[PDB]
From Swiss-Prot:
Induction: Expressed in actively growing cells, positively regulated by alternative sigma factor SigD, probably directly. It comes from the Bacteria. Factor that stimulates resuscitation of dormant cells. Has peptidoglycan (PG) hydrolytic activity. Active in the pM concentration range. Has little to no effect on actively-growing cells. PG fragments could either directly activate the resuscitation pathway of dormant bacteria or serve as a substrate for endogenous Rpf, resulting in low molecular weight products with resuscitation activity. This is Resuscitation-promoting factor RpfC. Transmembrane segments: none annotated. The chain holds residues 68 to 146 of 176 of the full protein.
Length: 82
């Protein structure tokens, strides 16, 4: 660190998906967050993060951090920004 870099929800999508918010890789993962479908089942399991825009997803994802834990995501986590 030097000064303090601003939190980046978009960059964290390129940390968990490393490509697309839709995650068109078929890894059973949605909202560019490598977040297990069995976990998303808490919010219905529905393709909500597949249809929800980047920022719309980050909103549901922000609450889903409390649902499963911040620890569910690796070193990458826009909740802290890094």
């Amino acid at each position: 660190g030097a000064m303090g870099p601003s939190p980046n929800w978009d960059a964290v999508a390129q940390c968990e998906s490393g490509g697309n918010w839709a995650a068109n890789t078929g890894n059973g993962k949605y909202g560019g967050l490598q977040f297990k479908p069995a976990t998303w089942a808490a919010f219905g399991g529905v393709g909500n993060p597949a249809a929800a825009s980047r920022e719309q997803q980050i909103a549901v994802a922000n609450r889903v951090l409390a649902e499963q834990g911040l620890d569910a995501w690796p070193t990458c986590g826009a909740a802290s920004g890094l």
